[PDB]
């Protein structure tokens, strides 16, 4: 049983670091979908820990806005030069795209050549939820394949490192292994195909 433990918003160097710190304490791979304004000098050494560490980047757009009613030229150029930082930094190019808010179109799909995912929410945007709170969400919603989408970045009180301290021992006690985005991918024997124009909550879709 697999699932992929994946990570909006980020980098940051103090909040970011939380969440790898836990993923090594339970040497656990996980997915980080980067937003490529927060990626430059600063953070360069943080985003090529998380590839050092076994850990895949992923493409969360330019900024924070949502993207469905963009134009072709505005989302290809979020994210092209989103790329462009985590390729400088990390060595990397990206196989997967998150879109903003979970917001898609037509256009969107048209206009991004990577594999859009969503997955399993856990309310820790809300920061009035407690790390007990997030963890339940997330335990109580996985099945195999499930992808689980929380953030590695928000605004404080954001106890969801000290989720991971539930999450992680409790999902392997029930069998199940972490994966990175493309290793549930392959290990499902599932190509990772940006022609397929649909969002993946789980794998299989
Ligand atoms: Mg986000």
């Given at each position: 049983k697999l699932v992929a433990l994946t990570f909006d918003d980020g980098p940051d160097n103090v909040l970011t670091a939380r969440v790898l710190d836990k993923l090594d304490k339970y040497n656990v791979k996980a997915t980080f979908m980067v937003v490529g304004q927060r990626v430059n000098d600063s953070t360069a050494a943080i985003i090529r820990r998380m590839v050092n560490s076994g850990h895949e980047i992923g493409n969360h757009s330019w900024?924070?806005?949502?993207?469905?009613?963009?134009s072709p030229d505005q989302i290809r150029k979020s994210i092209a030069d989103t790329n462009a930082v985590i390729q400088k930094y990390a060595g990397t190019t990206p196989k997967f795209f998150r879109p903003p808010n979970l917001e898609t179109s037509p256009t969107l799909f048209n206009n991004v050549d990577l594999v859009f995912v969503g997955g399993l929410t856990a309310?820790?945007?809300?920061?009035?939820?407690?790390a007990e709170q997030r963890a339940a969400a997330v335990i109580n919603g996985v099945r195999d394949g499930t992808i689980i989408l929380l953030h590695?970045?928000?605004?404080?009180?954001?106890?969801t490192p000290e989720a991971l301290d539930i999450i992680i021992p409790t999902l392997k006690s029930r069998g199940y292994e972490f994966v990175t985005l493309t290793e549930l991918f392959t290990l499902k024997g599932?190509?990772?195909?940006?022609?397929?124009?649909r969002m993946y909550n789980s794998v299989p879709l």
């Open positions: 900024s924070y806005s949502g993207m469905a009613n963009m309310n820790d945007w809300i920061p009035s939820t407690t590695d970045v928000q605004p404080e009180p954001h106890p599932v190509p990772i195909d940006p022609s397929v124009k």
